[PDB]
């Protein structure tokens, strides 16, 4: 069995290997990359996502989100408070202001320490989930707006044409902006490209051990757990690496830098934080191997999760027994 310890693997495809996305995902899996839940892909040196980032300041962040924490430094939830619209150029200035800028630090490890010690005492503002792309239309390899759609994959595997579209999203971050522990909708893959700026630190639980994280989370967030049997779908809970290690939960960590891709694999729980002002693009995708995960994915039906239009068909076709309850939670 490849990668039996479930370590995060880092890949350096050549330009030739970068031409066929699906083939390279399958290659990574043949080497056991999915067992970690997360992989890094460093593009060939010949590749670029676009020519420059000099002309992005007028992009609008219609609803920046202030991420307010409740709990203790290693075990907390966050809610999102909506803020007034602002442009990327305004957000970038905000991120670099004294209130929000990255502190002095020695290295990624020192900054990690500072994040877990101090995050709860501040409320950073995140421009998340903005539909759009920063890939040049002429970038033909690993362009996250030109991947094969999940609706086409489900049709190719199962024979049923479904409605829905699959487009990318932009994330504009600042120091301490935080992504809570989650798997993807319908336990899909995700791919995330860090276009510019400061790094993103990731934590990940192997898919084979996801239920260990879920059991701990029920213990640590007992009011949330009562409310919903899949409350990690709410995407509000944070647990630090120190607390995970105290509770024997298998996990790994890695820092992504600008110009690097990360892929999250089906049922790979992940969480993390941004080091400073940055912009990432991400999108969900599927492969044949996903289908069995999709059919078994847990679902939130309490109302909290609320998701995209295009999830409906995935539940309806893959999980017909669950669909009526889930749809009620949608409405
Ligand atoms: O970058 C972010 O804030 C969160 N990203 C992801 O969870 C992802 O790409 O799957
Ligand atoms: Mg612009
Ligand atoms: Ni994710
Ligand atoms: Zn729920």
From Swiss-Prot:
Its cofactor is Fe(2+). Zn(2+) binds at residues 228, 234, 300, 302. Residues 8-50 form the JmjN domain. The keyword Oxidoreductase applies. Residues 136-302 form the JmjC domain. It catalyses: N(6),N(6),N(6)-trimethyl-L-lysyl(9)-[histone H3] + 2 2-oxoglutarate + 2 O2 = N(6)-methyl-L-lysyl(9)-[histone H3] + 2 formaldehyde + 2 succinate + 2 CO2. Its EC number is 1.14.11.66. Ubiquitinated via 'Lys-63'-linked ubiquitin chains. Deubiquitinated by USP14 with the help of TRIM14 leading to stabilization. The keyword Ribonucleoprotein does not apply. Keywords: ADP-ribosylation, Chromatin regulator, Dioxygenase, Iron, Metal-binding, Nucleus, Oxidoreductase, Transcription, Transcription regulation, Ubl conjugation, Zinc. 2-oxoglutarate binds at residues 126, 192, 200, 235. It is found in: Nucleus. GO terms for molecular function: chromatin DNA binding; damaged DNA binding; histone demethylase activity; histone H3K9 demethylase activity; histone H3K9me2/H3K9me3 demethylase activity; metal ion binding. One of its GO terms (biological process) is inflammatory response. Fe cation binds at residues 182, 184, 270. Its main location: nucleus. Belongs to the JHDM3 histone demethylase family. This is Lysine-specific demethylase 4D. The chain holds residues 11 to 341 of 523 of the full protein.
């Amino acid at each position: 069995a490849q990668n039996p310890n479930c370590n995060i693997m880092i890949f350096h495809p050549t330009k030739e290997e970068f031409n066929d996305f699906d083939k390279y995902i399958a290659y990574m899996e043949s080497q056991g990359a999915h067992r970690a839940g997360l992989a890094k892909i460093i593009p060939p040196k010949e590749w670029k996502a676009r020519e420059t980032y000099d002309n992005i300041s007028e992009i609008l962040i219609a609803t920046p989100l202030q991420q307010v924490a409740s709990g203790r430094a290693g075990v907390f939830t966050q809610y999102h408070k909506k803020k007034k619209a602002m442009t990327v150029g305004e957000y970038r200035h905000l991120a670099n202001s004294k209130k929000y800028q990255t502190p002095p630090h020695q290295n990624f490890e020192d900054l990690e320490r500072k994040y877990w010690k101090n995050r709860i005492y501040n409320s950073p503002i995140y421009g998340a989930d903005i539909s759009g792309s920063l890939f040049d239309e002429n970038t033909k390899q690993w362009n996250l707006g030109h991947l094969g759609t999940i609706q086409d994959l489900l049709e190719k595997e199962c024979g049923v044409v479904i409605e829905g579209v699959n487009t990318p999203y932009l994330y504009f971050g600042m120091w301490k902006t935080t992504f809570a522990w989650h798997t993807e909708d319908m336990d899909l893959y995700s791919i995330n490209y860090l276009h510019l700026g400061e790094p993103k630190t990731w934590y990940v639980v192997p898919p084979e051990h996801g239920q260990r994280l879920e059991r701990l989370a029920r213990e640590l967030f007992p009011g949330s757990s009562r409310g919903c049997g899949a409350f990690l779908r709410h995407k509000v809970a944070l647990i630090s690496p120190t607390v995970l290690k105290e509770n024997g939960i298998p996990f790994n960590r890695i820092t992504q830098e600008a110009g690097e891709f990360m892929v999250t694999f089906p049922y790979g729980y992940h969480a993390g934080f941004n080091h400073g002002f940055n912009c990432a693009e991400a999108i969900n995708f599927a492969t044949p191997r996903w289908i069995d995960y999709g059919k078994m994915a847990s679902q939130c039906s309490c109302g909290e999760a609320r998701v995209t239009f295009s999830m409906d068909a995935f539940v309806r076709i893959l999980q017909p027994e669950r669909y009526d309850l889930w749809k009620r939670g949608q409405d």
